[PDB]
């Protein structure tokens, strides 16, 4: 449950 | 002797990192001013981790594998480095001069005070202070450097991990890049037992991480200085 973290991953 | 590919690594590494810090330091103007009159600095300095948090972000996803492994662990290796790999990095700015962290102008440099005006006593401030100073002393190759923060960023131990078989191969690949760069590239005497000391810093980080996680639960305890942090900073650091 990380949408920012996993956004700037992608 | 440094094979291709470790030299290759290394030519990743130098530019993943001067894609990711600008030593200019010109993006602070963007960050609520620094005010130093309680919890002062927070506002600042929220922001200014939440800025390097997606710095060490870009920097990471350079890295030699990183991209090979799952985005659970990608996660996981990030939230738990992330505090880590910024102490680490704030290297190039902290000044043994007078003991704080040199960012262009007087208006971003900080020092003990400010860090205590952010929410932090000395049980962190004192060895983090101790921290960048041992750092300074091995007088690191900018190779080195950035050999370091991926070996950080990728560690097999991180609570969460689940492929930690891929991690570890991920990591020895690095390590033995540095191992070889030390030998093959740092002369001595500053090579003398370079590598050891530089892993041994990153025990002190996990101990400086762990403390860090307390009195960031202490201060993100009460809403009202939750409420000052950004959203990045509140999702990565829990
Ligand atoms: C505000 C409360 C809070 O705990 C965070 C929730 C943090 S305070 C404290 C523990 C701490 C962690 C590392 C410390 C610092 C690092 C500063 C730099 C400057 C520059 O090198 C940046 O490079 C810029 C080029 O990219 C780095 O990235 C970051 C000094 C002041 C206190 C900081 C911000």
Same mark, same amino acid.
């Given at each position: 449950?990380?949408?920012?973290?996993?956004?700037?991953?992608? | 002797?440094?094979?291709?590919?470790?030299?290759?690594?290394?030519?990743?590494?130098?530019?993943?990192?001067?894609?990711?810090?600008?030593?200019?330091?010109?993006? /602070?103007?963007?960050?609520?001013?620094?005010?130093?009159?309680?919890?002062?600095?927070?506002?600042?300095?929220?922001?200014?981790?939440?800025?390097?948090?997606?710095?060490?972000?870009? /920097?990471?996803? +350079?890295?030699?594998? /990183?991209?090979?492994?799952?985005?659970?662990?990608?996660?996981?290796?990030?939230?738990?480095?992330?505090?880590?790999?910024?102490?680490?990095?704030?290297?190039?700015?902290?000044? +043994?001069?007078?003991?704080?962290?040199?960012?262009?102008?007087?208006?971003?440099?900080?020092?003990?005070?400010?860090?205590?005006?952010?929410?932090?006593?000395?049980?962190?401030?004192?060895?983090?202070?101790?921290?960048?100073?041992?750092?300074?002393?091995? =007088?690191?190759?900018?190779?080195?450097?950035?050999?370091? +923060?991926?070996?950080?960023?990728?560690?097999?131990?991180?609570?969460?991990?689940?492929?930690?078989?891929?991690?570890?191969?991920?990591?020895?690949?690095?390590? =033995?890049?540095?191992?070889?760069?030390?030998?093959?590239?740092?002369?001595?005497?500053?090579?003398?037992?370079?590598?050891?000391?530089?892993?041994?810093?990153?025990?002190?980080?996990?101990?400086?991480?762990?403390?860090?996680?307390?009195?960031?639960?202490?201060?993100? /305890?009460?809403?009202?200085?939750?409420?000052?942090?950004?959203?990045?900073?509140?999702?990565?650091?829990?």
């Amino acid at each position: 449950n990380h949408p920012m973290l996993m956004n700037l991953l992608k | 002797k440094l094979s291709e590919e470790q030299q290759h690594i290394i030519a990743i590494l130098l530019d993943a990192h001067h894609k990711t810090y600008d030593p200019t330091y010109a993006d /602070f103007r963007d960050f609520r001013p620094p005010v130093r009159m309680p919890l002062s600095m927070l506002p600042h300095l929220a922001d200014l981790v939440s800025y390097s948090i997606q710095k060490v972000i870009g /920097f990471a996803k +350079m890295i030699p594998g /990183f991209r090979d492994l799952t985005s659970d662990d990608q996660i996981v290796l990030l939230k738990s480095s992330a505090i880590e790999v910024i102490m680490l990095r704030s290297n190039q700015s902290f000044t +043994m001069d007078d003991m704080s962290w040199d960012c262009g102008s007087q208006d971003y440099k900080y020092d003990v005070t400010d860090v205590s005006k952010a929410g932090h006593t000395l049980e962190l401030i004192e060895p983090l202070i101790k921290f960048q100073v041992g750092l300074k002393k091995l =007088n690191l190759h900018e190779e080195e450097h950035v050999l370091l +923060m991926a070996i950080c960023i990728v560690s097999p131990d991180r609570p969460g991990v689940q492929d930690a078989k891929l991690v570890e191969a991920i990591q020895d690949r690095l390590s =033995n890049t540095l191992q070889t760069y030390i030998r093959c590239r740092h002369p001595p005497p500053g090579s003398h037992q370079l590598y050891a000391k530089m892993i041994q810093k990153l025990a002190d980080l996990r101990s400086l991480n762990e403390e860090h996680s307390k009195q960031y639960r202490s201060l993100s /305890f009460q809403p009202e200085n939750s409420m000052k942090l950004t959203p990045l900073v509140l999702e990565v650091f829990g």
